[PDB]
C-alpha cells in the first residue's frame, strides 16, 4: 500500500487546471506514492525511451545491430530533428539514432527506428513481452501527439510506465551491457533539466526521458534517480488538460516530482 500525500497533489493539479498522474517507487523498501496512477495519459515523446530499450533488446538477438548504418532523405526529416538532419547527407548508425531519440527527442530518428522494429505494433509487442499490458503505441511520430481526451491511442499509465522502466533499468528485462547502455542514454538526456531533474539534488545521478505533446496541456517525464546511500527511486509524472488550447507547465512536473520524493521520504 501507499503512504500518500494526496492533499498537496490535489491542490497542485487544481492550480494547473488539468490532471496529474504520478507513480513513484522506492526500490529498497517497496514504498509507493500513487496519484491517478492507473489513468491513461498520452505518452508523447516519452515512448522514445522504451523505443531504445526495444532496440537494445533486439541487439541481444542481433549482435552488432547498434553499429548498422542507416541512410535517409529529407522526406524522413520530421519537424524537430536536431540531430538526424545534421547527418542527412551521410546517415547515422542505429546506436546514434537511439541516442538522438532518447537524449534529444529526435522525431526523425524515432520514426526511422520504429520502421525497423515492426512499427508501433512492434514496439507494443516488445512491451507485452516484458510484462507491460497497459502500454500501447498506435501511430507514428507527431501523429501520436494528438492527445485527444478519452483516446486510448498512444497512451499508458504512470504506474505501468514506472514498473516497465524499473524492469528495463534495474531488472532482468535486459542483459548487463544492454541495461547499462540504457541507463547511460537516459543519464545523458538534454530535454529534462526543468522537470524531474529540477526536483532532484545535484549530487544524485538521474536518467530521464521527457515527452511534450504540445496540445491539451500534455507534458510528462519519467526517471530513475540514484540518491546517495539509498536504493534507487523510479518515478513517472504525466500531465494532461481538458482543453486543446491549454498549455503545459514544466514547473508543475517538477513540483509533482518534488511531492513524490517527499511522500516517499527523500
Ligand atoms: O540544430 C539544433 C540543435 C542541435 C543541438 S540542440 C538543438 N536544438 C535545436 N536545433 C535546431 C533544430 N533543427 N531542427 N529542429 N530544431 C545539439 C547538437 C547540434 C544541433
Ligand atoms: O541548442 C543548441 C544548438 C543550436 C544550433 S547548434 C547547437 N548546439 C548546441 N545546442 C545546445 C546543446 N544541445 N546539446 N548540447 N548543447 C543551431 C540552431 C539553434 C540551436
Ligand atoms: O520535441 C521537441 C519539439 C517539437 C517541436 S519543438 C520542440 N522542441 C523540443 N522538443 C524536445 C522535447 N519536447 N518534449 N520532450 N522533448 C515541434 C514539433 C513536435 C516536436
Task: For helices 94-104 and 47-61, give the axis angle rounded to 10 degrees.
Answer: 160
Strand-pair partners of 34 = 23
Neighbours of 167 (CB within 10 A): 17
Rounded Cα distance, 237 and 257, in Å: 7
Instruction: Please state the φ and ψ torsions of residue 177, each to the nearest 5 degrees.
Output: -65, -40
Going by alpha carbons, the residue nearest to atom 10 of ligand 3 is: 105
**Which domain covers residue 111, as residue numbers?**
1-266
- CA-closest candidate to residue 216, choices 241, 184, 191: 241
* DSSP state, residue 31: -
Neighbours of 2 (CB within 10 A): 15
Rounded Cα distance, 197 and 128, in Å: 29
The CB of 210 under 6 Å from ligand 3? The reply is yes
CATH number for the domain harbouring residue 233: 3.40.710.10
Q: And the C-alpha cell for 28?
A: 529498497
Q: And the C-alpha cell for 124?
A: 507494443
Strand-pair partners of 152 = none
User: Is there a contact between 108 and 72 (Cβ–Cβ < 8 Å)?
Assistant: yes
Q: What is the DSSP string of 170-221?
A: TSSSS-HHHHHHHHHHHHT-SS-TTTGGGGS-TTSEEEEEEEE--STT-EEE
User: Is there a contact between 158 and 237 (Cβ–Cβ < 8 Å)?
Assistant: yes
Q: How far is the CA of 204 from the centre of ligand 1 (A)?
A: 27
Rounded Cα distance, 75 and 60, in Å: 31
Rounded Cα distance, 92 and 94, in Å: 7
Active-site annotation, residues: 45, 143
User: Is there a contact between 251 and 228 (Cβ–Cβ < 8 Å)?
Assistant: no
Residues 6+ positions from 237 with CB-CB distance below 8 Å: 20, 21, 22, 158, 195, 196, 220, 221, 222, 253, 256, 257, 260
Instruction: Please state the φ and ψ torsions of residue 90, each to the nearest 5 degrees.
Output: -150, -25
Rounded Cα distance, 52 and 183, in Å: 11
Going by alpha carbons, the residue nearest to atom 3 of ligand 3 is: 80
Q: How far is the CA of 84 from the centre of ligand 1 (A)?
A: 9
State how many domains the chain has: 1
Atom of ligand 1 nearest to the CA of 80: 15
> Reduced to 3 states, what is the DSSP secondary structure of residue 12?
helix
Torsion angle defined by CA atoms of residues 247, 252, 254 and 259, in that order, rounded to the nearest 10 degrees = -160
Rounded Cα distance, 217 and 71, in Å: 35
Method by which this entry was solved: X-ray
Strand-pair partners of 70 = 92
Going by alpha carbons, the residue nearest to atom 20 of ligand 3 is: 80
- The bridge status of strand 32-35 relative to strand 19-26 is antiparallel
Q: Would you list which residues are annotated within the binding site for a beta-lactam?
A: 45, 48, 80, 105, 107, 210, 212
Atom of ligand 1 nearest to the CA of 104: 6
Least distant ligand from the CA of 81? 1
Least distant ligand from the CA of 107? 3
Per-residue exposure over 193-227, b if at least 16 CB sit within 10 Å of its own CB, e if not: eebbbbbbeeebebbbbbbbbebbbbbbbbbbbbb
Amino acid at each position: 500500500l501507499t503512504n500518500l500525500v494526496a492533499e498537496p497533489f490535489a491542490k497542485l493539479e487544481q492550480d494547473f487546471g488539468g490532471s496529474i498522474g504520478v507513480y513513484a517507487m522506492d526500490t529498497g523498501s517497496g514504498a509507493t506514492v500513487s496519484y491517478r496512477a492507473e489513468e491513461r495519459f498520452p505518452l508523447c515523446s516519452s515512448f522514445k525511451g522504451f523505443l531504445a530499450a526495444a532496440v537494445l533488446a533486439r541487439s541481444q538477438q542481433q549482435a552488432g545491430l547498434l553499429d548498422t548504418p542507416i541512410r535517409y532523405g529529407k522526406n524522413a526529416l520530421v519537424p524537430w530533428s536536431p540531430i538526424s538532419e545534421k547527418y542527412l547527407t551521410t546517415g547515422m548508425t542505429v546506436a546514434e539514432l537511439s541516442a538522438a531519440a532518447v537524449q534529444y527527442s529526435d522525431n526523425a530518428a524515432a520514426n526511422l527506428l520504429l520502421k525497423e522494429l515492426g512499427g508501433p505494433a512492434g514496439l507494443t509487442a516488445f512491451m507485452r513481452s516484458i510484462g507491460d499490458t497497459t502500454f500501447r503505441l498506435d501511430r507514428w511520430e507527431l501523429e501520436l501527439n494528438s492527445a485527444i481526451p478519452g483516446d486510448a491511442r498512444d497512451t499508458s499509465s504512470p504506474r505501468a510506465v514506472t514498473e516497465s522502466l524499473q524492469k528495463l533499468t534495474l531488472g532482468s528485462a535486459l542483459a548487463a551491457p544492454q541495461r547499462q547502455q540504457f541507463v547511460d542514454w537516459l543519464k545523458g538526456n538534454t530535454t529534462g533539466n526543468h522537470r524531474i531533474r529540477a526536483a532532484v539534488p545535484a549530487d544524485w545521478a538521474v536518467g530521464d526521458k521527457t515527452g511534450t505533446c504540445g496540445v491539451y496541456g500534455t507534458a510528462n517525464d519519467y526517471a530513475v534517480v540514484w540518491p546517495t546511500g539509498r536504493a534507487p527511486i523510479v518515478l513517472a509524472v504525466y500531465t494532461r488538460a481538458p482543453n486543446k488550447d491549454d498549455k503545459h507547465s514544466e514547473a508543475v512536473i517538477a513540483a509533482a516530482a518534488r511531492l513524490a520524493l517527499e511522500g516517499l521520504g527523500v
